[PDB]
């Protein structure tokens, strides 16, 4: 769980490698709120944050 400096304080990003199946070796990216709530996509994260951040130019995968 890495701090994501471009999100507000306490937000973290984690990348997880798939271990088996059709997409073995590909990864999934997750974000965690300061309380530890887990988010799995850009629109889910944007819905949660609302107007407190502008995510138009935010690259969900890299966190930049």
């Amino acid at each position: 769980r890495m701090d994501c400096p471009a999100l507000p304080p306490g937000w973290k990003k984690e990348e997880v490698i798939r271990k088996s199946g059709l997409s073995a070796g590909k990864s999934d990216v997750y974000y965690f709120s300061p309380s530890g709530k887990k988010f799995r996509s850009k629109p889910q994260l944007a819905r949660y944050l609302g107007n407190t951040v502008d995510l138009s130019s935010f690259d969900f995968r890299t966190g930049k």
Binding site: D3, P5, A6, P8, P9, G10, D54, L55, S56, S57, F58, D59, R61, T62, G63, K64
Partner: protein, 369 residues
């Protein structure tokens, strides 16, 4: 044959913008390394640039913008977020470890070289790290944090009445433009894509203001421009520019995202065509300061600036890439040159001649005899 000074700090390839980010400083290290193995390194004066301190960065920028940069880290990233938004540091300009170190090297290279040019102890000076032209006085923009170009130019003005700034980068050089928008001592010429593209500025009607009116030249362009079309509109315009603006020092930003198959760019230029511009400029035998800039298919960025360095030394190099630490990066081919794509050039002759003429009028407004 002109004397060339090359500025490089080994650390510059190792600073990293962030996962998924297109700007990759490593491309300068790739160039550096080719230059050594193409035997060009040998042939020019190689300088390590000391770090530029806040002292000389504030010669243009805010005392509290640089202060912010000197201070900010990924540690205190959630503490500063207030100031982060006021200064544009985020979505496409990340914070990252070493950021301020990176700026110091890019700026040090350009400034040191400017001095070198003023001190009249070189003809050409090259700093591929530099060229970061979207930066503003009080905010970062388009991957640029410090505008090394402005600072460089500001030093040159100490010995040069008129400084010409040429910008090949596919993106409009609005940082260098805005910084000198109201002065007649510096003329900013820029050839770039326009229309649903960054930075949204630099159309035909962007001419300057005040004393700086008729001193900001722009050439807006659509997708798919050839070497042939580009050459046929660069030489005419620049010869007029020299004719009219009569400068005593040139600063050529050699942005490599105007090449074909760039990740962000959508022009169809080859290294050959791209370089023909550097060669044409060099021909006007003025103190010259080559900087880099954009470029996001780094294999080609490497190729380009390696080639364009040869051009400053007017030495030939083979298409055969020499072995190097990153040799394996260069496709199945391992060649220096790239060829243009089947991509369609939407810059019809009619559209280029309309613009050309409008610019020729603008340039005629300057004083002459």
């Amino acid at each position: 044959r002109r004397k060339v000074c090359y500025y490089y700090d080994g650390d510059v390839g190792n600073y990293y913008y962030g996962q998924g980010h297109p700007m990759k400083p490593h491309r300068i290290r790739m160039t550096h390394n080719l230059l050594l193995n193409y035997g060009l390194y040998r042939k020019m004066e190689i300088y390590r640039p000391h770090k530029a301190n806040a002292e000389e960065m504030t010669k243009y920028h805010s005392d509290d913008y640089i202060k912010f940069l000197r201070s900010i880290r990924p540690d205190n990233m959630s503490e500063y977020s207030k100031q982060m938004q006021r200064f544009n540091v985020g979505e496409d300009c990340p914070v990252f470890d070493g950021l301020f170190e990176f700026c110091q090297l890019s700026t040090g290279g350009s400034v040191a070289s400017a001095v070198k040019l003023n001190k009249q102890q070189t003809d050409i000076a090259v700093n591929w790290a530099g060229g970061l032209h979207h930066a503003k006085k009080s905010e970062a923009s388009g991957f640029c944090y410090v505008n090394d170009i402005v600072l460089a130019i500001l030093e040159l003005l100490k010995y040069h009445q008129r400084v010409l700034y040429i910008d090949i980068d596919i993106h409009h050089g609005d940082g260098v433009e805005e910084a000198f928008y109201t002065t007649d001592r510096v003329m900013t010429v820029s050839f770039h894509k326009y229309g649903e593209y960054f930075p949204g500025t630099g159309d035909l009607r962007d001419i300057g203001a005040g004393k700086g009116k008729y001193y900001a030249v722009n050439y807006p362009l659509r997708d798919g421009i050839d070497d042939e079309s580009y050459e046929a509109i660069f030489k005419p315009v620049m010869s007029k520019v020299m004719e009219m603006f009569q400068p005593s020092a040139v600063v050529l930003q050699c942005g490599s995202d105007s090449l074909s198959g760039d990740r962000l760019g959508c022009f169809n230029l080859t290294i050959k065509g791209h370089a023909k511009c550097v060669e044409f400029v060099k021909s006007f035998n003025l103190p010259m300061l080559m900087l880099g800039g954009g470029g996001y298919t780094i294999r080609n960025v490497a190729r380009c600036w390696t080639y364009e360095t040869a051009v400053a030394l007017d030495t030939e190099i083979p298409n055969e890439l020499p072995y190097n630490d990153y040799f394996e990066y260069f496709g199945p081919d391992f060649k220096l040159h790239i060829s243009p794509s089947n991509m369609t050039n939407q810059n019809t002759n009619e559209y280029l001649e309309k613009i050309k003429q409008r610019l020729f009028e603008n340039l005629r407004m300057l004083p002459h005899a």
